[PDB]
């Protein structure tokens, strides 16, 4: 049928530009044949298909490739990601809803929907009458909406009794103070 | 490979036959932009970013031309081994919490796409939708397959039910992923 070629570059940053690693993958259909890994220092053949390339590239393009760690990776991070990606702050919306139709003294589940936030770092906690809940809290993975915002659902297994106050507590870099939402039976 | 951030400056994919190519920049897993090979422009997902940073599309075109070049060479090298078709798997979920009458967006996340050719469409009450639909470029996966997301703006109601239709060469028939509010 068809044939595919993929070229996938990766600039891995740690502690800002304190540690930058550059990995470049050359792939045929779904087989990576030759890879440049700055931790290694030169191109390498992953499979036989890469020998015709590794050999030659280490002679004519080694230094040019290594320099991209500064000319591309570091440059982009400091001059373009800095004023955009790294400055993006989107506050989470938090709302609680009950899974099953209410009936006091009957087991149920509270759902805290924390949505539309960026970046991914976030802390979501459940409290019942001022005490933090742990064992009965469950969560989805961090969901990437694909539009530069995430969402996550944190559930609390509970039994609504009169006078109780259930609080979903969210902490995020875009927030000076935590966002809390209460639900009373 | 762990790190605080990851920038993929210049993911370049080319496919034959058909002369299908894609050039994108991803940061921390999100799409910074893709270069429209035909219009020859850099299309930013977040339009505001194009005000603080810029990319010359030529770099995109050039990298694609090279992708094309390396495809012939590699196709010959494998003795014309064709790409295996995979079965894409779709998942539908709402962007925001579902509330009768409150505008929302349904998201169709399609994973394990290979090769990078697909049709992702929406059906509302079993009929095709045109308006309110947007789609991302293909995102790379650790196993070299791709994922893509489609978006449908909608208002949750009692009568409307939905389907994300996925049509791919690795699927005998278009698959429907059903979703309806509560």
């Amino acid at each position: 049928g068809s044939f595919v070629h993929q070229f996938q570059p990766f600039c891995y940053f740690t502690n800002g530009t304190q540690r930058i690693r550059l990995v470049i993958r050359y792939i045929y259909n779904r087989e990576e044949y030759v890879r440049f890994d700055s931790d290694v220092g030169e191109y390498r053949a992953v499979t036989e298909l890469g020998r015709p390339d590794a050999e030659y590239w280490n002679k004519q393009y080694l230094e040019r490739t290594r320099a991209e760690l500064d000319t591309v990776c570091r440059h982009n991070y400091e001059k373009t990601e800095t004023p955009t990606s790294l400055r993006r702050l989107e506050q989470p919306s938090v709302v609680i809803s009950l899974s099953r139709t209410e009936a006091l003294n009957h087991h149920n589940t509270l759902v805290c929907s924390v949505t539309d936030f960026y970046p991914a770092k976030i802390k979501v906690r459940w409290f019942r009458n001022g005490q933090e809940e742990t064992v009965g809290v469950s969560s989805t993975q961090l969901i990437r909406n694909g539009d530069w915002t995430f969402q996550v659902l944190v559930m609390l297994e509970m039994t609504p009794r009169r006078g109780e106050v259930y609080t979903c507590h969210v902490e995020h870099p875009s927030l000076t103070s935590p966002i809390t939402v209460e639900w009373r039976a | 490979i762990e790190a605080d951030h990851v920038g993929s400056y210049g993911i370049t994919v080319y496919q034959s036959p058909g002369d299908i190519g894609q050039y994108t920049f991803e940061f921390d897993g999100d799409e910074l932009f893709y270069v429209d090979l035909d219009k020859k422009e850099t299309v930013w997902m977040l339009p505001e970013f194009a005000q603080l940073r810029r990319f010359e599309p030529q770099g995109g075109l050039q990298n694609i031309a090279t992708g094309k070049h390396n495809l012939e060479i590699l196709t010959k090298r494998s003795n014309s081994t064709p790409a295996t078709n995979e079965a894409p798997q779709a998942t539908v979920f709402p962007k925001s919490p579902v509330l009768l009458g409150q505008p929302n967006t349904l998201i169709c996340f399609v994973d394990n796409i290979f090769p990078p050719v697909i049709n992702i469409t929406w059906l509302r009450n079993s009929k095709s939708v045109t308006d309110g639909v947007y789609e991302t470029s293909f995102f790379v996966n650790r196993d070299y397959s791709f994922h893509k997301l489609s978006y449908l703006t909608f208002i949750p109601s009692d009568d409307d039910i939905y389907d994300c239709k996925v049509e791919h060469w690795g699927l005998e028939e278009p698959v429907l992923k059903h979703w309806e509010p509560e």
């Binding site: 070229f7 570059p9 600039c11 550059l22 470049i24 015709p52 390339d53 030659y56 590239w57 393009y61 040019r64 490739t65 991209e68 000319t71 591309v72 440059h75 982009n76 001059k79 373009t80 004023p83 | 400056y9 210049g10 370049t12 920049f25 603080l52 940073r53 810029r54 990319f55 010359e56 770099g59 995109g60 990298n63 090279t66 992708g67 070049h69 390396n70 060479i73 590699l74």
Partner: peptide
Amino acid sequence: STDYGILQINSRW
């Protein structure tokens, strides 16, 4: 500022 892309190298015919 301007973004720079990582260069893809052309294999030999």
